[PDB]
Design brief:
Chains A, B: It holds the Pfam family RPE65. Chains A, B: One of its GO terms (biological process) is carotene catabolic process. Chains A, B: This is Carotenoid cleavage oxygenase 1. 2 copies of one chain form a homodimer. Chain A is mainly beta and about 500 residues long. Chain A has one domain. In chain A, about 5% of the residues lie in helices and about 40% in strands. Chain A has 3 helices and 34 strands. The first copy, chain A, is globular and about 55 Å long. The interface of A and B includes residues 20 and 32 of A. β1 (about 25) of chain A pairs antiparallel with β1 (about 25) of chain B. Bound molecules: cobalt (II) ion (2 copies).
């Protein structure tokens, strides 16, 4: 077999990216400042963190085993609990004490036959008393919110229609439905997309099969009152390339950024309309809604070239690290229209941004606050000379958060400091009476001076100021998505505004 | 109540001394080099690590909650398991989410009445399928070797005669007895010493009550074939000073270093002889044995002033940090002699040393190999300009290990590097056929460059060279004592030579 290294080597696991791989508890975390005593609930986040050194050299950050952090808040005290998801991958490699799963999304490179290849490392959501650890090539893994015990692969009482479950389901605050989909829904390289929803009782509601114009990556999607919307990233999969040891994904300069629109309820596959936005990279959806005229306003990060530069086009053509910027775009769509091409989008701010969050109490409805990560190249904001040699590679950099008010147009910027970077933020309603976007924001910080992580707490009244700074004595390697589960919310999700 | 800080402040918890306070697992530790595949067993060590910030400012290092590390070795793989001892202190302070126990060994400063004040932080030994977490003001706490679960305060099936159990019991390799004692055996300020042993069946054998000339600290002791020996450190306890908020311990320049000698079997209290060594500090016992003439050779670290400088004499007279050196002393005693004063000891090497270990297969018998920590002030060995501002205070420094052959007089010295310091080493017999002192040595390293810990593995054939270097991604705060439990030894202790 390919030799399994006994320590981590490569830029993707160097410095702050070096895996720690701890599981357990750190209770009563050190706090500078004061955590508001009214805050009660848990911040769950997930990071890729390889448990064993890969036999693939420069294994991308996206292929690391999912490790779940939970920050449990009550009366101004906070405890950390940390535990790996017991994926099939994790368990079999642990038993073997060596890596066995090979390249990202390529089963033909695995050293043993896997039934489920999930690393469960992309998102961690709350649904009906369980956490669901998500990875878009697989079903979810279900976990205990309190202990982080892994229950196992989850199929919604045998109702799951698809081989795949998106990392970005949406939670309707009014209907209490979880709105889902999966792409490559019938296996590697398939153009099948399964759109499906579950009601708050756990029963499957919608199930609609449709066909993608290309086998392209659909990472995120958007839900409005009457429509679901699928933006396709121009990364394309050829199974025959994979069979020869090639990458699952490869960029295609020849195609638009397709944006499918399906009616949300009672449709068939042939009701989908594949609109054609100008070529570019579909980033994360902040939110979408229908305006007064019945048109879809889709707000999302959007870039003009391949953000995932490590999977270039057929001739190796693509951008370099740090070259591509994504911007906060509004796209307008009309399901009625028969004009397939779409106009260039209007942009809401000029910042290089990603990881947008809203107040999820207005998800699927008109929103007017958005919180997002920014990467500000303005001199001095990040001390690159100090940070870069300690940072390693593979992971996106964000050196502040921004709060946009869409009514006023005001932006507030939180800048943790010249030697700190941020992950994705969460928003927490102040209480169940609070106005849209009024509450607290938390965000995990990489502190390159200490080589430690910190959890910052911010009041939306003044995002520039840390109300508290929770000081972890270990590193939490840069991660992907996270969510707040408030104690006062019985189903884990906030009440509609 | 005194306010409980919400983060750690002070030299005693700064830099590398900052508590981490994690519990759990890191499996499959990164290894540079190669761990010998024949090594099978567990290295258990204990560190003081305050779980909550004290309300006492500059609480000494000795008053931190005991956290047990276990390094589990098999076929060249190693896993870390880490867990706090569930002392009464730990549990009640966890329940309260604030510190409640006050000053070192002073119940009059506690905010609540404790039954047991143990931090269980000094040593961790194996006895009859349990670990015993030791602290000399208390009985042991018993723990599971495999899971590190705390069973609770342990009293040897209700046979424990003493309120106190030494942190330095001795394990007779021939009789398989655990030889024990406790000082302050009837409570704070008592001059009662209980000497007691247990046979390998768990039944109590010896129990002898004797009287100390002063209420002085007896940290370590020594056991030979026919005698037990109690060196008394000139730190003295006055309960009335304690009732006023004062220190449990205070140095006394007016008294000798008493060395009691009792016959090991069948004695009464009045059989003890209190010999009077020249005034000085009784450090750790390497080992003691009876020679050809029936005389006791007691080999121990010995200093000429108060090593514990933070508890000075009644007028605050005492040394400064880094001033006092301890040296490897041989003392000769004769139980027959009626001459109480003893000669100045002969010294075995020149080095400033502490933490001596032998091959425990010859404990109580003549030994000819000793392994010990050294602190070499010679310029270059330690890059103090770099280390000191990152180190914090409270804990002893050691910048190498030494191996002395007592027959040949040869010394080998392991120097981890200019920016690394060491804890106490363990010795591991190569196999059950191995000669005295032939095997492997492990030692935990503080790496001030990475701010990480590392576990070094050395072959006694060449102590200057690391056979393997196990790289932890977290800090293990400097600790106290540790032990090896070999898999091939059914009762946890090696077979007599
Ligand atoms: Co995502
Ligand atoms: Co000791």
């Amino acid at each position: 077999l390919p030799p399994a290294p006994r320590y981590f080597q490569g830029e993707n696991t160097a410095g702050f990216m070096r895996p720690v791989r701890f599981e357990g508890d750190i209770t009563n975390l050190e706090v500078v400042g004061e955590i508001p005593k009214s805050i009660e609930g848990t911040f769950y986040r997930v990071m890729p963190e390889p448990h064993l050194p890969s036999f693939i050299p420069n294994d991308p950050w996206f292929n690391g085993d999912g490790n779940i952090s939970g920050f449990y808040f009550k009366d101004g005290h906070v405890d950390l609990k940390q535990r790996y998801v017991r994926t099939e991958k994790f368990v079999r490699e642990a038993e073997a004490r060596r890596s066995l799963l090979g390249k990202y999304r390529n089963r033909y490179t695995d050293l043993v036959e896997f039934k489920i290849r999930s690393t469960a490392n992309t998102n961690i959501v709350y649904w009906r008393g369980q956490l669901l650890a998500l990875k878009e090539d697989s079903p979810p893994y279900a976990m205990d919110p309190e202990t982080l015990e892994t229950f196992g692969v989850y199929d919604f009482d045998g109702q799951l229609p698809s081989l795949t479950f998106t990392a970005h389901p949406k939670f309707d605050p009014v209907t209490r439905e979880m709105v889902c989909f999966g792409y490559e829904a019938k296996g590697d390289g398939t153009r099948d997309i399964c759109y499906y929803s579950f009601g708050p009782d756990g029963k499957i509601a919608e199930t609609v099969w449709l066909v993608s114009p290309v086998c392209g990556m659909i990472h995120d999607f958007a839900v409005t009152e009457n429509f679901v919307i699928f933006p396709i990233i121009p990364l394309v999969c050829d199974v025959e390339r994979m069979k020869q040891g090639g990458d699952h994904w490869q960029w295609d300069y020849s195609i638009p950024m397709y944006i499918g629109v399906l009616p949300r309820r009672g449709a068939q596959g042939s009701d989908v309309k594949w609109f054609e936005a100008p070529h570019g990279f579909a980033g994360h959806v902040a939110n979408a809604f229908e305006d007064d005229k019945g048109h879809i306003q889709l707000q999302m990060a959007y870039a003009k070239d391949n953000v995932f530069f490590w999977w270039p086009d057929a001739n190796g053509k693509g951008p370099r690290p740090g070259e591509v910027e994504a911007h906060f775009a509004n796209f307008v769509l009309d399901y009625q229209s028969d004009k397939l091409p779409l106009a260039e989008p209007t942009y809401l701010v000029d910042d290089d941004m990603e990881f947008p969050r809203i107040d999820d109490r207005v998800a699927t409805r008109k929103h007017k606050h958005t919180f997002f990560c920014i990467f500000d190249r303005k001199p001095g904001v990040t001390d690159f000379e100090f940070v870069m040699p300690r940072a390693g590679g593979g992971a996106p950099m964000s050196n502040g958060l921004a709060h946009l008010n869409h009514e006023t147009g005001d932006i507030q910027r939180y800048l943790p400091g010249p030697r700190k970077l941020t992950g994705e933020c969460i928003f927490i309603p102040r209480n169940s009476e609070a106005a849209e976007g009024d509450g607290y924001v938390m965000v995990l910080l990489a502190n390159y001076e200490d080589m430690c992580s910190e959890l910052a707490v911010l009041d939306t009244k003044d995002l520039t100021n840390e109300v508290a700074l929770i000081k972890l004595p270990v590193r939490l390697r840069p991660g992907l998505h996270g969510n707040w589960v408030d104690k006062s919310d019985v189903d884990g999700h906030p009440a509609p505004l």
